[PDB]
Amino acid sequence: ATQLQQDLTGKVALVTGAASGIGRDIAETYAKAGAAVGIADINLEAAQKTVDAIEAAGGRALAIAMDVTSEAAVNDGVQRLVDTFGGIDILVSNAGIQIIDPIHKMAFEDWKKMLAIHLDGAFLTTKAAIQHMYKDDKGGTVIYMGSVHSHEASLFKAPYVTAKHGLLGLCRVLAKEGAVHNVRSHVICPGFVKTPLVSVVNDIMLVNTVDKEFTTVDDIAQLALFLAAFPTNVFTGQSIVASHGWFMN
Amino acid sequence: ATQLQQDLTGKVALVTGAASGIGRDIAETYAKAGAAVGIADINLEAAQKTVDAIEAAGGRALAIAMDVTSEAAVNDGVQRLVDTFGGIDILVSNAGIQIIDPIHKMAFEDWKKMLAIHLDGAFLTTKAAIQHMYKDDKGGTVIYMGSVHSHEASLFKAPYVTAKHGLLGLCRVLAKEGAVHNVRSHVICPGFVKTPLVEKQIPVVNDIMLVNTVDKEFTTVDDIAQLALFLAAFPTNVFTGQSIVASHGWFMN
Amino acid sequence: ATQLQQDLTGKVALVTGAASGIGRDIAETYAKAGAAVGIADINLEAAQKTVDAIEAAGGRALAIAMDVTSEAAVNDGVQRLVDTFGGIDILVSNAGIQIIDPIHKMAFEDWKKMLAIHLDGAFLTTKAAIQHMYKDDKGGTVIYMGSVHSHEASLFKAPYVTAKHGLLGLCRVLAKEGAVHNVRSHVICPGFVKTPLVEKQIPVVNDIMLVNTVDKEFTTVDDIAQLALFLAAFPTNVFTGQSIVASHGWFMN
Amino acid sequence: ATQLQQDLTGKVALVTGAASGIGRDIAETYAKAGAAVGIADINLEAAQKTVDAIEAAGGRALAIAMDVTSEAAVNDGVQRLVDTFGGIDILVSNAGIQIIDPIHKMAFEDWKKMLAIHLDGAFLTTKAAIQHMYKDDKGGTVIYMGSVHSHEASLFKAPYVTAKHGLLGLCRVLAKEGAVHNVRSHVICPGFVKTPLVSVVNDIMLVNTVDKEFTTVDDIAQLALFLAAFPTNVFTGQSIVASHGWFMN
Numbered sequence A, D: 001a002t003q004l005q006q007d008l009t010g011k012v013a014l015v016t017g018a019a020s021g022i023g024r025d026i027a028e029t030y031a032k033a034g035a036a037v038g039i040a041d042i043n044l045e046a047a048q049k050t051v052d053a054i055e056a057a058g059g060r061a062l063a064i065a066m067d068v069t070s071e072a073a074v075n076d077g078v079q080r081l082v083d084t085f086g087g088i089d090i091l092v093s094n095a096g097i098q099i100i101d102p103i104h105k106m107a108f109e110d111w112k113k114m115l116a117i118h119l120d121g122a123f124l125t126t127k128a129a130i131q132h133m134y135k136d137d138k139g140g141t142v143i144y145m146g147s148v149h150s151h152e153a154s155l156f157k158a159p160y161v162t163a164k165h166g167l168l169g170l171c172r173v174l175a176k177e178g179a180v181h182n183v184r185s186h187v188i189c190p191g192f193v194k195t196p197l198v199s200v201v202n203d204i205m206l207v208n209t210v211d212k213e214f215t216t217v218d219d220i221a222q223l224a225l226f227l228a229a230f231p232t233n234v235f236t237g238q239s240i241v242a243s244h245g246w247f248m249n
Numbered sequence B, C: 001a002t003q004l005q006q007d008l009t010g011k012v013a014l015v016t017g018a019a020s021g022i023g024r025d026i027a028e029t030y031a032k033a034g035a036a037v038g039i040a041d042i043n044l045e046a047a048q049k050t051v052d053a054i055e056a057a058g059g060r061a062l063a064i065a066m067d068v069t070s071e072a073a074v075n076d077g078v079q080r081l082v083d084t085f086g087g088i089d090i091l092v093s094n095a096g097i098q099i100i101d102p103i104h105k106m107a108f109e110d111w112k113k114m115l116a117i118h119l120d121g122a123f124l125t126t127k128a129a130i131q132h133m134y135k136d137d138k139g140g141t142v143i144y145m146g147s148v149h150s151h152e153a154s155l156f157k158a159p160y161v162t163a164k165h166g167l168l169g170l171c172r173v174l175a176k177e178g179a180v181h182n183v184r185s186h187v188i189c190p191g192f193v194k195t196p197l198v199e200k201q202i203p204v205v206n207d208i209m210l211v212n213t214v215d216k217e218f219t220t221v222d223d224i225a226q227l228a229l230f231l232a233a234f235p236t237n238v239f240t241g242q243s244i245v246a247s248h249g250w251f252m253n
């Protein structure tokens, strides 16, 4: 007989895009579970509001100004976290935006900005984090925020669907490379969540759910906690879809 | 902010193949979380040993003699659970065997026995459980024990790989049909786990069984029971229709 | 530079369910490409109508009474083909039916009949064919008729979706086992095709059957027969173990 | 009863990376089938050698200097093809390179160059081609050269595996957007092919094939011809793996 593990006491997490939405709930949930959390965002003011909540709720957190498209910013922010809290055990690569246009109308600079935030952000934060996690094979957890759009397409979302598909590939390579250093990788794939990023609802957005339900920030934060606290590397390399039956993986 | 849901207080679960291995740990884990558990197995003596362990830890369980290939045995055993504990909230369709032979040598009898246990057992237990769960749209959770062999093949396991692929299909249909009645479905897909199904099999570990893991680790019964508890206690239907692979990187889903 | 291979001169094919629909067009297409074709069906009169069409076009075929759920009927019918034309190079396991009911209402008899036709038929025909193909490592091609329902579910089709998922598993095992004997395996996965299986079903097209296509088009029997000819005539084993979805964008594999 | 279709008489194809390897065989195969072919490559000399072969073999072709990372080069090259041969019916987005390093050692500029060639090249060539194909809903075929590495990972290939995964996503969005304009999309996913880009063979490279066989350039060119000449849009949005049993899709 066994039981669930959820204690993150003594762990340090970095969450990108943690000033808002999914990333904010993951960060607040990890802090409740005992982790010290780096709140990494391009919106430093909004990042410090998240830190203020975590600290008032009895946790530990640090606001980190980080544009995840910038190599120097990512490197500097990861170093600040390690200098403040002593290491980095968990990375959640979550920062993202949406830009909607059909391929034939889409500006090239909009395509490139989308790949830079979703794909370059994942590479840069992963590489910076694993230089620490690989030391003495201490290890750690890397979670990417994918989507149902990691697995299938929608109209007018070419760069988003391309990037969310690509994150599966990056996760799968890290699972293979990280194993000898006790690093595990995962992709969480939500359906539509009513964050700021989000008949329109029921006939377009939730049409391919089985039950006409949004995914919630708590759904994703519980899954992120289950993975981060899991006692073995059994889920390394996996994606898990959390979508109320929209794409059954 | 949130936290994990772990409580199954007031719930009633049926676990097939709960006399041994993965099913025994799921059943003991559910009982520790507060569920009353039906220990359904063809081995009634070993089923009662699971019940004794659950009772020794302060939980509630019932040994149920059930050959999951038999419609009467499934229907009667689900009815015995409902009569005893008042309903059925969770079904774990887990009973299974392995029979190894290449296709060109495999006895048709062995092909049919494999599909009867894995696929007919899943259909019969699902149908019997959802006739209760659909009443007043009370709902419930159906978990199938799949495999990495739900998603890819190995040599000499045709009927097993066929069946474990088939369970994804049945799960995906139930997710669509069950939604209006608050029924959710999932498939758990372990890699190799050192139960008796596998221990018997070894007389191989590093260069056959674990060759496509990233870290040369077996999956454990506690890995699968923790995932089974996470799903059964989950507070929303967000994972309905999904399979989750628990294999140390053997088939990255 | 290269070009398509289309020639099946000298080859012998067995197509199950070749009295109607997708199987009839595959069989007629193979015969036009030079294959001698066994027209295996439970409907012997309609099987002979396929043979008459093949002969009228200058091809060779044989009507074979075969209930693919019967081990004796499969073994005897494969042996009749080998006795007549000298061997078996290509098997297309295609016979099938549809039975629609939600899980909670579905008769167990109907569940078992569906798995017997789709899954036992695939096992029995595969095993009988590869005992010939494995001789002297001559080899051959085994194609299973899957579906979009190999990869995702629809309401009210539990046993069909289970079976079509299962055929991927059997194909994947055969690709591994058959390699040393020059046997390759594939699954073709059509979307809706307006055969009698579907025509009967309509008395729906735009908002159920074709709702998840990108272009509101049925798949056609000629789409599937062209893919079946491309695979059977292919000059290397490069596609062994693969499924190919032919559905106008319903499930993008 | 039916038969295979392979005639490309009256069609115009653009193949990127067509001076070498897979792209060269596709181009020569399309020209044999009657298409006029744009041989688009960064190596213009090698592109003109391919054109010389096609022309001596009785076909029609044009050498196009095209770095597929450059918006202007892609736009100019597609326009030259349309000015020379009257339109564009088929695009094969195939140009690629490989750069091998584990994530923790990989230079950021190597990550970005890989995504630019594989992903920006696919976007830029797609967008330029479909501005023509969408006119009067004439339509056309877009094929991306993926990989088994569209579907699973290998060690030390992070940006390649990320990009080849991403191409599935781009293809799936184009299938949905293109349908109303009679545009179909596909991804071909080869296993290892002995091009210049390619115990090492049998125990590493071909270890996950069922039969220890390389995929060949003719395997891929036959599949590319089957798709380009197919009489209906039935395969739109699909990937097809051609790998001797390495990843069974």
Ligand SMILES: NC(=O)c1ccc[n+]([C@@H]2O[C@H](COP(=O)([O-])OP(=O)(O)OC[C@H]3O[C@@H](n4cnc5c(N)ncnc54)[C@H](O)[C@@H]3O)[C@@H](O)[C@H]2O)c1
Binding pocket: A016, A017, A018, A019, A020, A021, A022, A023, A040, A041, A042, A043, A046, A066, A067, A068, A069, A094, A095, A096, A097, A117, A145, A146, A147, A148, A189, A190, A191, A192, A193, A194, A195, A196, A197, A198
């Ligand atoms: N909301 C949904 O329906 C949904 C579903 C699936 C996946 N996702 C993914 O979840 C993630 C979080 O999205 P969300 O809905 O919570 O959005 P959100 O807009 O609420 O939060 C995104 C956060 O990322 C930050 N950010 C944006 N660009 C940044 C950059 N360059 N560097 C650092 N931080 C940056 C923003 O300031 C913001 O705080 C994204 O990757 C998104 O693609 C969202």
Ligand SMILES: NC(=O)c1ccc[n+]([C@@H]2O[C@H](COP(=O)([O-])OP(=O)(O)OC[C@H]3O[C@@H](n4cnc5c(N)ncnc54)[C@H](O)[C@@H]3O)[C@@H](O)[C@H]2O)c1
Binding pocket: B016, B017, B018, B019, B020, B021, B022, B023, B040, B041, B042, B043, B046, B066, B067, B068, B069, B094, B095, B096, B097, B117, B145, B146, B147, B148, B189, B190, B191, B192, B193, B194, B195, B196, B197, B198
């Ligand atoms: N062990 C592994 O590596 C592994 C990996 C993936 C999936 N699985 C699956 O996990 C499930 C449990 O297997 P396990 O490894 O715990 O095996 P196990 O042999 O320890 O337990 C299987 C149980 O099923 C029972 N059973 C067999 N036939 C039955 C029938 N007709 N009716 C009722 N009960 C019956 C047995 O008596 C036994 O108690 C099976 O479905 C198996 O396919 C196992």
Ligand SMILES: NC(=O)c1ccc[n+]([C@@H]2O[C@H](COP(=O)([O-])OP(=O)(O)OC[C@H]3O[C@@H](n4cnc5c(N)ncnc54)[C@H](O)[C@@H]3O)[C@@H](O)[C@H]2O)c1
Binding pocket: C016, C017, C018, C019, C020, C021, C022, C023, C040, C041, C042, C043, C046, C066, C067, C068, C069, C094, C095, C096, C097, C117, C145, C146, C147, C148, C189, C190, C191, C192, C193, C194, C195, C196, C197, C198
């Ligand atoms: N039509 C579709 O939309 C569609 C789509 C995807 C897959 N499929 C599959 O294609 C295959 C062919 O179906 P179809 O649409 O051409 O149907 P069809 O009804 O036109 O042909 C099926 C044939 O199978 C034969 N058959 C049935 N039971 C048999 C048995 N026990 N033994 C031997 N022959 C038997 C029938 O007599 C008939 O001639 C089936 O496996 C079906 O599941 C059909």
Ligand SMILES: NC(=O)c1ccc[n+]([C@@H]2O[C@H](COP(=O)([O-])OP(=O)(O)OC[C@H]3O[C@@H](n4cnc5c(N)ncnc54)[C@H](O)[C@@H]3O)[C@@H](O)[C@H]2O)c1
Binding pocket: D016, D017, D018, D019, D020, D021, D022, D023, D040, D041, D042, D043, D046, D066, D067, D068, D069, D094, D095, D096, D097, D117, D145, D146, D147, D148, D189, D190, D191, D192, D193, D194, D195, D196, D197, D198
């Ligand atoms: N060879 C394999 O094993 C294999 C397997 C799967 C997929 N692939 C893919 O097939 C495609 C072709 O690879 P190949 O093996 O034939 O390689 P190759 O090296 O023989 O040919 C690649 C061609 O692309 C050209 N090219 C490179 N950068 C370019 C740029 N920026 N703009 C335009 N042209 C450029 C090169 O000059 C060359 O002519 C690639 O996308 C590769 O990823 C190859």
